[PDB]
Amino acid sequence: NLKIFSLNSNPELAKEIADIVGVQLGKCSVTRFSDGEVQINIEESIRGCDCYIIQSTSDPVNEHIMELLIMVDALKRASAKTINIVIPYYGYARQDRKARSREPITAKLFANLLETAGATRVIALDLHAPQIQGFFDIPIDHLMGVPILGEYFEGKNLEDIVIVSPDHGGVTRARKLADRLKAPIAIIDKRMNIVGNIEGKTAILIDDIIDTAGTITLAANALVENGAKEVYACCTHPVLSGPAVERINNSTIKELVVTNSIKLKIERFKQLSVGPLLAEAIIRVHEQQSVSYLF
């Protein structure tokens, strides 16, 4: 049958996914010996079971990566039938090529590591570059989070919107959101110009990851300065490190909308859940049903 294990990155999301699915989370202690080495106890036999491990490789990234790899090894040697990795947030996704000399392509190395450890398949959400799906030779399902952010805004009954991409590489994303809301797009062209008509419109800034918030807050204020009626901001993954919160709270962003792909105070925010989406992906993968239906 189906066993779901949660590691340490996002226990809540895991529990939420297990409940939506209708099963109790797997019994296992994933602790740390006194020396910081990862210790793993899977307290119930799992021979012949299909295991799903839920882990975001978010802060601290290297610890979550290692306890994930170590867990995969434990399951492989314990005879799991399949070892399915559910990764709500894929750390290192941004290092997807040699942008400069002698740089590692970490997203690819992670992929090689996971396969070497023994992973059977991966279920990922809003990967920074969709080409990362090709970094694996094991099956990998890539879910989009935009439909979730889109539904929330549509329910706000907004009028006169313009979807804004905070930089050059986010235009495709901005376009997927514009499509769903039947709206135009404008882009921030920082060398900080604004390409597109944002005058008197409700601007929605969308990015995949919101990390330090420099570009996003900087872009918001400039949207307002240039005539936008109000600015909303959203992303799938709330990394929010450094002075992010500080910056967001002090900006002109009316509301920051994020998902719980990463565990988290912000004054004007709203966290949407990707629990239902992942749970449903899990069931379909497990009942061998079409996943394309989720798109």
Binding site as annotated, residues for ADP? 98, 102, 133, 141-142, 290-292
For residue 250, what is the DSSP state?
T
Instruction: Choose between 169 and 200: whose C-beta lies nearer to ligand ABM.
Output: 169
Round to whole Å and give the CA distance between 40 and 160.
53
Round to whole Å and give the CA distance between 142 and 162.
27
Strand bridging mode 193-195 / 253-259:
unpaired
> What residues are designated binding site?
35-37, 94-95, 98, 102, 128, 133, 141-142, 167, 207, 211-215, 290-292
Instruction: Choose between 80 and 143: whose C-beta lies nearer to ligand ABM.
Output: 143
Give, in order, the Cα–Cα distances in Å from 171 to each of 185, 186, 207, 219, 294: 8, 9, 9, 15, 23
> What residues are designated binding site for Mg(2+)?
128, 167
Do 251 and 225 contact (CB within 8 A), yes or no? no
Instruction: Choose between 134 and 169: whose C-beta lies nearer to ligand ABM.
Output: 169
Amino acid at residue number 67? E
Instruction: Choose between 213 and 279: whose C-beta lies nearer to ligand ABM.
Output: 213
> End-to-end alpha-carbon separation of the chain, Å?
27
Instruction: Choose between 133 and 212: whose C-beta lies nearer to ligand AP2.
Output: 133
Closest CA to 272 of 263, 264, 260: 260
Q: Cβ of residue 242: shortest distance to ligand ABM, in angstroms? A: 10
> What residues are designated binding site for ATP?
35-37, 94-95
Q: Cβ of residue 275: shortest distance to a copy of itself, in angstroms? A: 23
Which range, of 13-21, 76-84, 91-99, 146-154, touches ligand ABM by CB under 6 A?
Answer: 91-99
Do 22 and 70 contact (CB within 8 A), yes or no? no
- Chain positions 243 to 282 lying near a copy of itself, rule: CB under 8 A, are none
Phi/psi at 222 (5° precision): -65, -30
Which range, of 22-30, 94-102, 195-203, 281-289, touches ligand ABM by CB under 6 A?
Answer: 94-102
Q: Cβ of residue 202: shortest distance to ligand ABM, in angstroms? A: 25
From candidates 99, 101, 191, 295, binder to ligand ABM by CB under 6 A:
99
Q: Is 263 a catalytic residue?
A: no
Strand bridging mode 161-165 / 185-189:
parallel
Helix, strand, or coil (residue 262): coil
From candidates 94, 176, 254, 268, binder to ligand ABM by CB under 6 A:
94
Residue 188's CB: how many other CB atoms inside 10 A?
24
The interface partner of residue 94, options being a copy of itself, ligand AP2, ligand ABM, none and the CB cut-off 5 to 8 Å by kind, is ligand ABM
34's tokens: 């006194």
Task: Choose the catalytic residue: 15, 190, 229, 263.
Answer: 190
The DSSP annotation for 202-242 comes to EEEEEEEEESS-HHHHHHHHHHHHTT-SEEEEEEEEE---T
- For binding to ligand AP2 (CB under 6 A), which residues are involved? 98-102, 133, 141-142, 144, 290-292, 295
Q: Which residues bind ligand ABM (CB under 6 A)?
A: 94-95, 99, 169
Tell me the catalytic residues: 190
